[PDB]
Amino acid sequence: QPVLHLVALNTPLSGGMRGIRGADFQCFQQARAVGLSGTFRAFLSSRLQDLYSIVRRADRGSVPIVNLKDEVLSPSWDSLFSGSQGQLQPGARIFSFDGRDVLRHPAWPQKSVWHGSDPSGRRLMESYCETWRTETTGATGQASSLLSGRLLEQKAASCHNSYIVLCIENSF
């Protein structure tokens, strides 16, 4: 049964992530540290990339999305970008690579997730912290409150905030 893992980085990050190459490298390093074999990319839109396109086309329609512990979060990647704003089922849990529940652990003081995307997973050039290069208070990035059970809520948040960053396995 194919599945794609959605896992959080071990620490929150502000909008200044050294760009998408920086965020992607963190996903690579942290997955490798725990023995995960798949290819993990940061769950973020950037200048040249829409979040929606990060998962291989063949795995977008019918491969369930699961957390680190293989608990099912969504029936497919496409389901998240239907316009529901990435609604997860109640009680859904998201774990970091080292096994901590991001909602129950104090290491993530703010339960919001950076994404820089609209509800269909397309890039928001005016709201992605200058492609994740700045943490200045005046700049914004599109983020979502995990407390509301959604991954793609449309909140423009100051880039100076330290939020949860997710990594998605790009293919089974």
Resolution, in Å, please? 1.5
> 3-state class of 77 per DSSP?
helix
The answer to whether 24 is a known ligand-binding residue is no
Rounded-to-integer distance, Cα 76 and Cα 64, Å: 5
Rounded-to-integer distance, Cα 120 and Cα 95, Å: 24
The answer to whether 5 is a known ligand-binding residue is yes
Q: Decide: 143 and 115 in contact? Cβ < 8 Å.
A: yes
CATH code of 71's domain: 3.10.100.10
Of 42, 59, 161, residue with least CA distance to 97? 42
Query: Domain count of the chain?
Result: 1
Pure H helices in 34-154:
77-80, 129-132
**Distance of alpha carbon 144 from the chain centroid:** 10
Three-state secondary structure readout of the chain: CCCEEEEECCCCECCCCCHHHHHHHHHHHHHHHCCCCCCEEECCCECCECHHHHCCHHHCCCCCEECCCCCEEECCHHHHCCCCCCECCCCCCCEECCCCECCCCCCCCCCEEECCECCCCCECCCCEHHHHCCCCCCCEEEEEEHHHCECCCCEEEECCCCEECEEEECCC
Range of the domain at 26: 1-172
